[PDB]
Amino acid sequence: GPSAEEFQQLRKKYTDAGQGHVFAFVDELQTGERSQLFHQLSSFDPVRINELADKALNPPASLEPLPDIATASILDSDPKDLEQWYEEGLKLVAGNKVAVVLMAGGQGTRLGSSAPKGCFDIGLPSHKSLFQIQAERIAKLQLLAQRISGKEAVIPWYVMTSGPTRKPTEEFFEQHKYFGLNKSDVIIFEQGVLPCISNEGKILMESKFKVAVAPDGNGGIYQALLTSGVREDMRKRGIEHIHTYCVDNCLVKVADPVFIGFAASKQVDIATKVVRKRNATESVGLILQKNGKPDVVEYSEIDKETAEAKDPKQPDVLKFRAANIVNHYYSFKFFESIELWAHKLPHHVARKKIPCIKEGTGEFFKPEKPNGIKLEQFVFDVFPMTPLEKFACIEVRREDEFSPLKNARGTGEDDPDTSKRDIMSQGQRWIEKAGGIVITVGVEVSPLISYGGEGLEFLKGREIKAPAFIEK
Ligand SMILES: CC(=O)N[C@H]1[C@@H](OP(=O)(O)O)O[C@H](CO)[C@@H](O)[C@@H]1O
Numbered sequence: 524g525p526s527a528e529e530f531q532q533l534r535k536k537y538t539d540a541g542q543g544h545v546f547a548f549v550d551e552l553q554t555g556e557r558s559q560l561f562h563q564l565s566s567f568d569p570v571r572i573n574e575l576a577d578k579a580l581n582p583p584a585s586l587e588p589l590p591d592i593a594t595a596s597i598l599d600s601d602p603k604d605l606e607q608w609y610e611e612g613l614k615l616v617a618g619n620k621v622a623v624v625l626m627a628g629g630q631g632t633r634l635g636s637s638a639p640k641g642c643f644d645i646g647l648p649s650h651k652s653l654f655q656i657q658a659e660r661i662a663k664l665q666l667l668a669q670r671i672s673g674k675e676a677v678i679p680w681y682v683m684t685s686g687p688t689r690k691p692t693e694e695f696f697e698q699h700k701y702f703g704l705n706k707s708d709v710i711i712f713e714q715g716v717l718p719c720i721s722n723e724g725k726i727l728m729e730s731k732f733k734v735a736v737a738p739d740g741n742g743g744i745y746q747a748l749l750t751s752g753v754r755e756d757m758r759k760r761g762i763e764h765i766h767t768y769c770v771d772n773c774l775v776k777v778a779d780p781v782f783i784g785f786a787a788s789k790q791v792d793i794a795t796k797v798v799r800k801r802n803a804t805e806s807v808g809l810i811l812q813k814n815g816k817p818d819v820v821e822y823s824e825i826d827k828e829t830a831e832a833k834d835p836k837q838p839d840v841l842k843f844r845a846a847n848i849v850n851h852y853y854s855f856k857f858f859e860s861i862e863l864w865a866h867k868l869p870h871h872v873a874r875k876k877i878p879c880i881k882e883g884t885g886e887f888f889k890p891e892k893p894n895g896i897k898l899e900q901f902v903f904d905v906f907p908m909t910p911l912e913k914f915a916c917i918e919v920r921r922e923d924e925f926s927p928l929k930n931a932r933g934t935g936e937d938d939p940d941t942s943k944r945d946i947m948s949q950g951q952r953w954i955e956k957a958g959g960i961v962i963t964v965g966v967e968v969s970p971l972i973s974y975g976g977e978g979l980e981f982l983k984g985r986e987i988k989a990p991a992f993i994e995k
Pocket residue numbers: 741769806807808809821822846847848849901902903927929
């Protein structure tokens with residue numbers, strides 16, 4: 524393990540930085556525990572931690588709805604354009620130019636599962652997990668693309684996890700044989716962490732030999748794409764277009780060809796999907812403009828007066844209603860610039876009850892009130908680095924595209940039951956549109972049968988008894 528000299532040099536750095544309390548219990552640690560503490564502390568720069576704590580604890584507009592050059596809506600689109608963008612998106616898939624990054628490092632504190640959120644079974648007839656439904660969407664788009672190329676189509680799946688989720692995620696994917704995808708085209712990687720900070724700016728000790736850390740927010744994606752090797756893998760594959768999304772949306776149109784096609788046609792660096800906000804209290808970030816710059820306002824920071832503000836000309840409708848649904852497109856060229864701006868991203872403060880050592884006794888205690896803060900970066904904080912002309916915000920239909928799993932069963936909204944209803948409602952609607960008659964709520968349609976409502980003609984004239992599950 525670490526030499527005395529190495530350990531003293533580390534101790535000097537931390538002590539000079541006013542963080543020498545992290546070594547309060549060194550004299551009683553076992554060799555292994557001492558090693559852990561050494562390596563963990565070596566992984567942070569205590570001066571940087573001080574810089575972050577200082578900005579957090581002693582912190583240092585032109586703020587209207589997005590302009591019309593920057594916005595589009597599926598509702599207002601010419602159907603011939605939607606068809607063309609879909610075809611162009613599928614051609615890019617067939618070209619092996621499309622990748623997916625899945626943000627699955629969330630805890631799911633509101634959901635109360637012990638397992639990764641992606642593993643959750645919302646109670647469909649199939650009992651498929653969120654991960655498996657997403658994987659099957661990828662499989663299906665590959666198969667559709669192969670129809671046009673006559674060659675293998677691969678959409679690599681890069682799954683970002685946290686330390687709370689990485690091992691069980693990999694085990695789950697392995698036990699399912701990667702849901703019929705090739706393991707060689709799925710990479711599970713971890714996002715980074717930052718130390719939790721006390722109200723007084725001091726690093727919190729989880730144990731006598733471990734610093735309390737937390738994942739660094741979904742904005743941690745960008746640094747993690749470099750350190751993980753993922754960006755290099757995309758380069759080696761000739762990836763040009765990336766779809767990034769959150770695991771909790773059970774209706775997510777993974778690698779949606781119309782989205783990719785549209786974004787690519789406009790040659791944007793970034794595109795993003797929104798829906799109309801369902802009310803002033805919905806826990807969604809709101810996409811709007813700031814200071815000549817596309818930007819977002821998170822639900823945890825917005826002020827009542829803006830969440831409740833009304834449209835100038837229509838006083839019964841909310842002014843800000845472009846709910847961020849965490850559904851983003853990037854050019855690969857954008858990812859090649861990460862190094863120039865990853866350090867420019869802000870840290871957002873969240874005050875938290877961080878279980879730690881009673882700084883004295885060494886007794887582990889869950890505190891009664893918030894004893895410190897976690898810092899997080901947010902994926903959308905790149906939007907202001909991007910010229911308005913290299914940005915697109917598209918309205919899509921909530922009932923087809925956005926059904927988040929946030930809360931435990933019995934909450935009443937954004938829960939397993941709303942998720943299940945939304946998928947099975949989608950299924951029924953697709954069947955009906957293809958000429959099927961459903962007798963009854965709803966019908967689960969496997970993604971391997973239909974990605975987006977296509978391919979259901981074989982049900983024309985048929986009677987389907989709901990609840991049902993259409994599969995192989
Ligand atoms: C940083 C980030 O991506 N935040 C997202 C994300 O919030 P959560 O706090 O992870 O629930 O999901 C919302 C949609 O469910 C979206 O509106 C919001 O902006």
